[PDB]
Amino acid sequence: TKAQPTEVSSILEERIKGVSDEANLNETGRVLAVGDGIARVFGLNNIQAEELVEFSSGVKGMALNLEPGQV
Amino acid sequence: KAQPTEVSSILEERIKGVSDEANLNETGRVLAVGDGIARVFGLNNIQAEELVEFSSGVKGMALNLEPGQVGIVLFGSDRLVKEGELVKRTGNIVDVPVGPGLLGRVVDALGNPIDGKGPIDAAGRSRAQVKAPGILPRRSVHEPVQTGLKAVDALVPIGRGQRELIIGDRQTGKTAVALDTILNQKRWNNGSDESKKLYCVYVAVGQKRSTVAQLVQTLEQHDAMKYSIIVAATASEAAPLQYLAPFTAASIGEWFRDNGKHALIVYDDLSKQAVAYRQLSLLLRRPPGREAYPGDVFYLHSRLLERAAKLSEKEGSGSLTALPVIETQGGDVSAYIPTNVISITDGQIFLEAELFYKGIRPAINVGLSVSRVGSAAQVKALKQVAGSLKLFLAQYREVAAFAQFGSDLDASTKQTLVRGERLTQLLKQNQYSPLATEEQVPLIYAGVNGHLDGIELSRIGEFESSFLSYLKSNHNELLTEIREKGELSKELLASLKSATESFVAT
Amino acid sequence: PPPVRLFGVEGTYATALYQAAAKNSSIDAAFQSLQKVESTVKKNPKLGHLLLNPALSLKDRNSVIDAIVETHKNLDGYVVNLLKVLSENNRLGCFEKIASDFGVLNDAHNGLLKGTVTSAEPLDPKSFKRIEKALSASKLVGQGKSLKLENVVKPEIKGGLIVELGDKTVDLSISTKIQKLNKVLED
Amino acid sequence: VRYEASLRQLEQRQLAKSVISRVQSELGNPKFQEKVLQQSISEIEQLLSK
Amino acid sequence: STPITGKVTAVIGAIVDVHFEQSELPAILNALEIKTPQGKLVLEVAQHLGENTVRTIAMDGTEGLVRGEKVLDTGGPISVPVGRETLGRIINVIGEPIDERGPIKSKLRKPIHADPPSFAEQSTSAEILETGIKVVDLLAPYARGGKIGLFGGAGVGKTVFIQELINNIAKAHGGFSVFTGVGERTREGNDLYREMKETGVINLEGESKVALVFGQMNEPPGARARVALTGLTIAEYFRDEEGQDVLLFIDNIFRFTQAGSEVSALLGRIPSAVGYQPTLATDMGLLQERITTTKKGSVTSVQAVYVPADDLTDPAPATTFAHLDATTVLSRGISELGIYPAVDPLDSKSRLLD
Amino acid sequence: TPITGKVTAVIGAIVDVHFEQSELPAILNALEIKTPQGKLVLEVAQHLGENTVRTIAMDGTEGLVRGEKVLDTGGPISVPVGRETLGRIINVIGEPIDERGPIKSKLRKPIHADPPSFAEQSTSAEILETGIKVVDLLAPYARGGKIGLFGGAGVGKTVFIQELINNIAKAHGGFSVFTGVGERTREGNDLYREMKETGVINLEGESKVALVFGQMNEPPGARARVALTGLTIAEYFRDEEGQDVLLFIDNIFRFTQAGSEVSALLGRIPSAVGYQPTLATDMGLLQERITTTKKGSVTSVQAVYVPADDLTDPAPATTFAHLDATTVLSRGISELGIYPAVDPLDSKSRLLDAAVVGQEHYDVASKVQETLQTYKSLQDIIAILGMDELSEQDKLTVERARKIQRFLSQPFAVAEVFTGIPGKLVRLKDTVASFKAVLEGKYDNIPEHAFYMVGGIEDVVAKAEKLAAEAN
Ligand SMILES: Nc1ncnc2c1ncn2[C@@H]1O[C@H](COP(=O)(O)OP(=O)(O)OP(=O)(O)O)[C@@H](O)[C@H]1O
Ligand SMILES: Nc1ncnc2c1ncn2[C@@H]1O[C@H](COP(=O)(O)OP(=O)(O)O)[C@@H](O)[C@H]1O
């Protein structure tokens, strides 16, 4: 029907291996796309809505949209 | 006879010669044609805005490139381009034939002539998307474009390289100003000096076929077709042709600009070009802006009109001067389109409908029509004998709504009211009779200095031709003085005052 | 740095698969196993094809996958795991398409530059062979890589032939030449 | 001069319908067969040349 | 012989998606048939979605279509019977008569999406068409092969005016009339037919002087966006073949603009400003520029205008008025003084009063 | 270690670069591509993931092929700075087009820096006397603040800026950085000749201005950054030298419109009327770096173009909160000949308090706005019936109001060729006393036309005497 959002080449590759990194990503995540003061981010399965996060450089963020694939 | 078959057989040799080297590092299938645009798979080495050719003769421009497929806009009806056909790529950014051999011809947007006078003697190809000349090879304008109308060269003068706007309403006499200017350039196109000739490129977009047919017939009655170039993009043909055709005509203009000669171009009318552009941007899902012209429609008329200025001596002192035409809606000057052409061009000639409704043709509203770098490039004579005329018509416009009360007034307002009515009736002009500056000076000179005030108001229309024939039969040397010198000295002024007061006395 | 991009239209699943298996060598096996699972879908057409419908389940798709691998133990290794992802992602319907695309990528790795010799009627073998040779004896193919070649029948063309491959083509046929003759003589 | 240009246009449209007649003349031939040889040798000429 | 048979895969209102088997696809604007128990159901291919799958707009009611029915192709565009046998025969946009006077024994069948005439053939001096009514030929003369905007609501003798034009073109220039009601009210369609019988311009036994094309209101919008083209092609065959000066009557061109709006809003194209379709100028031009004067003959068009909400900056009259050579107003205050016709003199202005 | 990528998508002025090195170049870095025309500079806007960036194009991208090599430069778009850049016409990238050789300067600072801190903010009540009547009476411009000229299409934004150049920039002593954003190329050339002749630009000598242009011809990547180039040259002199910096910017609306020609293409959903959704932040970053710190002053004059006089347009309505002294120009005033067509109603300033400009000045300004507000309220009854149906206080009020309107005109030193009158630079105190005199009723019998297009009240008396000697 339409391309979904958890279908990038860098994320399916790891799932094909059988490493299943998504279960291991509760406290940590990875940046998927980050423009215009917005950061679609993969990971953090234990994250809440309206929860504070810190990126590894030093700039902070609020998690608003919890989709199935990404945050 | 068989002479065109001879020529076409030589072209068959070219086609057969091209078939011996035809290996099209490009071809791809047409995935889907929809919304009047095609998606093509393949073509892994194409350029942005590269011309392609489908297998039915309809050419196309590839305006966007995506990982996976390329989106090519059409150049005609989509009735011909079928799904699953074959897409050779030509190899070029979108170009048109430029050079002097187009003079006399009537082409559409891609250099295909449609007059029926054989192929274009083409002196070269040039891109449609040329970067405008930067701020360094520019000179501010200092040469007149004598339009031949009375009121235009009186009030709102046009310099070679000064982009002036003819804005107006529907069926209010918009095209006639540009047509009279093209017919006025016959004064120098018959002549010998190149730097006084002025080639006219009239670019009809969105108009009817038969209107462009009558306009070609008009420019061959009065013999303008030894210097005219008609680029026709008539409203039967589909939208990206109209999106393209004024740009290709601007390439035609730049060919005359870089090569030292001077050339006038007339866009007519860009309010249908923005119609074609909002059609091409509302079929590609690009979201509309104010009044549904898409958000870059300022940029379109920008990148069009900025390829026209006066080159300095460093590039060859050539020029290109543009008159876009904007069809507003009911005397409006504040829709989104006519507040983008105004914010580019160096002034307006606002042809208001109400004055043409009173028959005063051409109907220049004087108090609105202004030009910004016109004044530095008028003929010196008119600038000497019409430095009051703009301020005097402003004065008469001040007392326009004050005299509607019908109240009895003083002497000064009656004097200015009579002289203002004589000047308003004075600036009328019939069709196809542009008056050269050598005759525009004495009529305005009779208007300024109160000589008309004894004449009744109806005789002024025949006073024009009577005073002109009086000067043509007797004071011919004064007209030659104004022709050669272009300036009124004191002796010229006194002789002109004598020659006025003579014919004014009867 | 993988060869022949899929880019966009659902070949990315294959792309991931390719690059995930490219670093672990086993691609031919993967390719062969894809051939075998495509054939065992084709050789069981009722609900081998018609059970590739979106209205089933999460669980029933998973069990079809299990039913599919029940026929053969150790189905390669990677292509048995990828199905689970697709079963969970419910992109199973667009699956044999992925088989064809992985085939394209694979025979690109072999270098089979599939071509075509379009006509409006099939031709003798001598022409086929002579053209295939020429195409093999060409710049086009740099050798070290193969060269298929398919004649097709096209009525929409009036005859002649056109050679096609590597989005690079030559058309010396009849229809186009009639077109060009007409255009030049229609002025 | 106007009538000369009109007569040239009439000559060209007569040869246009004669081109239609030539299309009708060409399409019945075993040039449909013989011309496949022309493409064959032409592809030999093109593809060997690089 | 060699049919191009595919299956209907999707019926959405008046939009119909047709799948074709591979390497067979007709291009845009080609007629497709579906056989029904009630008759035939015509489609016109307007968009190719890829996947050997086309998307068409309806031309008749799309109830009851099982998806999976055979889709027969006819290659060309919508064919219409033309010529002498069409006179006095009420043809819909399909090409079949609906007056129940049997099938029309016409000699040719013409496409409707033809090319407009090329620029070398456009007649370079628009003369005056002698219509015959005095106030027309005096004040606002109709351009020979030009366009004429006939304003005013019904009940002011507009049908009387247009039958008078029919008789006077039949007498003076000998030309025939092709009337076309795009979006015509069905009841006044029948009343116009009865009145055109009784006034003598339709003779059911002799030689009638008009061809009626009534695209009714209860057809889906793809019909009304081609009914004017049907009337236009019946005009073009009388122009370029038998060499006459033919009057093409169109009522009412604003309903044609509505047909354009709803066709190109059913296709999912983004709507423009006010809400008319973004192909406004081009899909008015493909109706206007086929009504012109060649060196063989000419078709002059009288087409009405329903001014929307009494406003003339709305783009549908503001697009029609970039094409109309001469207007003619049938006002109220002139028939109220008992004047036949009610051509108001101060308002009906021409661009060829020069 | 060069970082190579491939062009994989071109849509107009937006180009996609796929990388295969896992070190992707960060946001706001400059890529470049070797073209057959030379080079071409890109700016990385957003990462799409999949090792793919999506960039805006600082120049025209006719004729790129999918897969062309994309080269990295590491940092943002660097701009030459310092005294070396004076009298030079620097393009958006930093290639000069005055063709007088490259700009042999020391540092090249990147454009994208943060605004100064809140503790670094400075205030100043330094009133700038400009010599225009309608400014220095009703809305006094502030040194160190910002000055807005909201103006419609062709009612004298650019003429008013050249007026402020010709009345300030000679007697300023600091420097000036002019920045042509999307204006006319020809107007850029005419300002260049005016800078050469009046000695602001001294070609062989030392100049005081820095031209940073880039016009409406450029594709929208350049117009969304050219104001940042002029900004960086401005704040360099604000921070490196500690001077006073005049920052003339014309036109700031073209910046946001370049914000609206890429955002529909970068996959942002269309916002309100058609502009981007990232508007208050981008206008915020462009405005908040034009400020006044403890190192120097930046007194900037920024034109604002308004599309078709609709001041509910989101871009100038957003711009209003950033400016310390607005000035509204309206076409309905300019048709009556009142030049300049400063709307006396809607003009404001952070200045014009009684404790800032003096109590007399404040009272005069309040009385003038009261009289003109009374006129604008009584506008409709005048339009319907006429002036005769008023009271006898309010008829005098309307007459004095129409005196003061035609008195607000002022013959400009730059618009000398339109009116034929030489320039008039009227100081502040004479204007204060002049309006105080006309408010107190000392001149109520003077005909109205003698107020028109005048300097001070002395020239009103003189011109009324001229028309008295003429009409007699
Ligand atoms: N000087 C004149 N003498 C006679 N007629 C004139 C004159 N000026 C204008 N007209 C009339 O104006 C009418 C329209 O002219 P023109 O085409 O310039 O208007 P327009 O608004 O440009 O129309 P369009 O926009 O459709 O081209 C013509 O019919 C012409 O007769
Ligand atoms: N002092 C003045 N006197 C007369 N006219 C003026 C004056 N100032 C500006 N104008 C008018 O304003 C126009 C300049 O407007 P400008 O702001 O340059 O246009 P834009 O909106 O394109 O920037 C000129 O055409 C001129 O007629």
Short mmCIF file of N, CA and C in Angstrom, two decimals, chain E residues 176-210:
data_model
loop_
_atom_site.label_atom_id
_atom_site.label_comp_id
_atom_site.label_asym_id
_atom_site.label_seq_id
_atom_site.Cartn_x
_atom_site.Cartn_y
_atom_site.Cartn_z
N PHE E 176 -26.32 25.37 -41.84
CA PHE E 176 -27.09 24.54 -40.93
C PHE E 176 -26.75 24.86 -39.49
N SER E 177 -27.62 24.41 -38.59
CA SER E 177 -27.49 24.67 -37.17
C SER E 177 -27.20 23.38 -36.43
N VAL E 178 -26.29 23.44 -35.47
CA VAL E 178 -26.06 22.34 -34.55
C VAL E 178 -26.29 22.89 -33.16
N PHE E 179 -27.39 22.51 -32.55
CA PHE E 179 -27.66 22.92 -31.19
C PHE E 179 -27.11 21.88 -30.23
N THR E 180 -26.64 22.36 -29.08
CA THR E 180 -26.03 21.47 -28.09
C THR E 180 -26.38 21.97 -26.70
N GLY E 181 -27.21 21.21 -26.01
CA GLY E 181 -27.48 21.49 -24.62
C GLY E 181 -26.60 20.67 -23.72
N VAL E 182 -25.50 21.25 -23.28
CA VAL E 182 -24.70 20.68 -22.21
C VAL E 182 -25.42 20.99 -20.91
N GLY E 183 -25.75 19.96 -20.14
CA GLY E 183 -26.40 20.22 -18.88
C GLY E 183 -27.80 20.74 -19.02
N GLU E 184 -28.45 20.46 -20.15
CA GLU E 184 -29.76 21.02 -20.42
C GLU E 184 -30.80 20.35 -19.55
N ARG E 185 -31.67 21.17 -18.96
CA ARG E 185 -32.84 20.66 -18.26
C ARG E 185 -33.67 19.80 -19.20
N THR E 186 -34.00 18.60 -18.75
CA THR E 186 -34.58 17.59 -19.63
C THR E 186 -35.96 18.01 -20.11
N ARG E 187 -36.76 18.59 -19.21
CA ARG E 187 -38.11 19.02 -19.55
C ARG E 187 -38.09 20.11 -20.61
N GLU E 188 -37.28 21.14 -20.40
CA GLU E 188 -37.15 22.14 -21.45
C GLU E 188 -36.36 21.65 -22.64
N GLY E 189 -35.64 20.53 -22.50
CA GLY E 189 -35.15 19.84 -23.68
C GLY E 189 -36.28 19.36 -24.56
N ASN E 190 -37.28 18.70 -23.96
CA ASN E 190 -38.41 18.23 -24.76
C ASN E 190 -39.24 19.39 -25.27
N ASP E 191 -39.40 20.44 -24.47
CA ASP E 191 -40.16 21.59 -24.93
C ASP E 191 -39.45 22.30 -26.08
N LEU E 192 -38.12 22.33 -26.05
CA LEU E 192 -37.39 22.88 -27.18
C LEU E 192 -37.54 22.01 -28.41
N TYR E 193 -37.57 20.68 -28.24
CA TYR E 193 -37.75 19.81 -29.39
C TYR E 193 -39.12 19.97 -30.03
N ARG E 194 -40.16 20.05 -29.20
CA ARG E 194 -41.52 20.23 -29.72
C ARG E 194 -41.66 21.57 -30.42
N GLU E 195 -41.09 22.62 -29.84
CA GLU E 195 -41.18 23.93 -30.45
C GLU E 195 -40.36 24.01 -31.73
N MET E 196 -39.24 23.31 -31.80
CA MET E 196 -38.48 23.28 -33.04
C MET E 196 -39.12 22.40 -34.10
N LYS E 197 -39.99 21.47 -33.71
CA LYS E 197 -40.85 20.85 -34.72
C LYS E 197 -41.86 21.85 -35.24
N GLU E 198 -42.60 22.49 -34.34
CA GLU E 198 -43.73 23.30 -34.78
C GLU E 198 -43.32 24.59 -35.47
N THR E 199 -42.08 25.03 -35.30
CA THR E 199 -41.69 26.23 -36.02
C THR E 199 -41.16 25.94 -37.41
N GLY E 200 -41.02 24.67 -37.77
CA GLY E 200 -40.59 24.31 -39.11
C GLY E 200 -39.11 24.08 -39.29
N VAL E 201 -38.28 24.36 -38.28
CA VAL E 201 -36.85 24.10 -38.44
C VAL E 201 -36.53 22.62 -38.31
N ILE E 202 -37.43 21.83 -37.74
CA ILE E 202 -37.34 20.38 -37.78
C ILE E 202 -38.53 19.88 -38.58
N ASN E 203 -38.26 19.29 -39.73
CA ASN E 203 -39.27 18.60 -40.49
C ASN E 203 -38.99 17.11 -40.37
N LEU E 204 -39.93 16.37 -39.78
CA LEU E 204 -39.77 14.93 -39.61
C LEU E 204 -39.93 14.17 -40.92
N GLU E 205 -40.34 14.84 -41.99
CA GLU E 205 -40.57 14.21 -43.28
C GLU E 205 -39.69 14.76 -44.37
N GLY E 206 -39.41 16.06 -44.34
CA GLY E 206 -38.54 16.70 -45.31
C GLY E 206 -37.12 16.81 -44.82
N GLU E 207 -36.51 17.96 -45.07
CA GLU E 207 -35.11 18.20 -44.75
C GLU E 207 -35.03 19.20 -43.60
N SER E 208 -34.75 18.70 -42.41
CA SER E 208 -34.57 19.58 -41.27
C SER E 208 -33.20 20.25 -41.35
N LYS E 209 -33.03 21.31 -40.56
CA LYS E 209 -31.90 22.20 -40.71
C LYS E 209 -31.07 22.32 -39.44
N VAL E 210 -31.08 21.29 -38.59
CA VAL E 210 -30.44 21.38 -37.29
C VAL E 210 -30.13 19.96 -36.82
#
